[PDB]
Design a protein around this ligand. Structure first.
Ligand SMILES: O=C([O-])c1cc(C2CCCCC2)ccc1O
Length: 133
């Protein structure tokens, strides 16, 4: 019952500063333009202790599965090879990615009927709001 309020299928409804976030992370121009245009569906599910997050769009379809607090190796949609740990902190899913001595944090929060995603790198924040599909 750890992530009950996050489970379901979610669709992007608004975005702010996403280009700038992608630039901070090091994403190249063509990828930023195509990924920025994406309208992803985020599908979150839980089976026992294993959480699965899928992100589907015309840009890329990705899937991660994990156990809270347990590190994994992930290839991101922009093809970074990162070491990721996802934890629950005060009801917020906190996803930290480390690679090449850099770090970024992606927080997912339930706020009213929305799932709000905040992506942060070096003072550059992007806010992505999803609603139930
Ligand atoms: O679409 C999203 O909402 C979303 C996308 C990403 C990555 C996409 C590829 C480039 C780096 C960011 C990270 C978190 C997100 O929440």
């Amino acid at each position: 019952h750890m992530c009950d309020a996050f489970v379901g299928t979610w669709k992007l409804v608004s975005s702010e500063n996403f280009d700038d976030y992608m630039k901070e992370v090091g994403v190249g121009f063509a990828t930023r333009k195509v990924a920025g245009m994406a309208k992803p569906n985020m599908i979150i599910s839980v089976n026992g202790d294993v959480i699965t997050i899928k992100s589907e769009s015309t840009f890329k379809n990705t899937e991660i599965s994990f156990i809270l607090g347990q590190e994994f190796d992930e290839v991101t949609a922009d093809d970074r090879k990162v070491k990721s740990t996802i934890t629950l902190d005060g009801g917020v899913l906190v996803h930290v990615q480390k690679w090449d001595g850099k770090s970024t944090t992606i927080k997912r929060k339930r706020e009213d009927d929305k799932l709000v995603v905040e992506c942060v790198m070096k003072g550059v924040t992007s806010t992505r709001v999803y609603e139930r599909a």
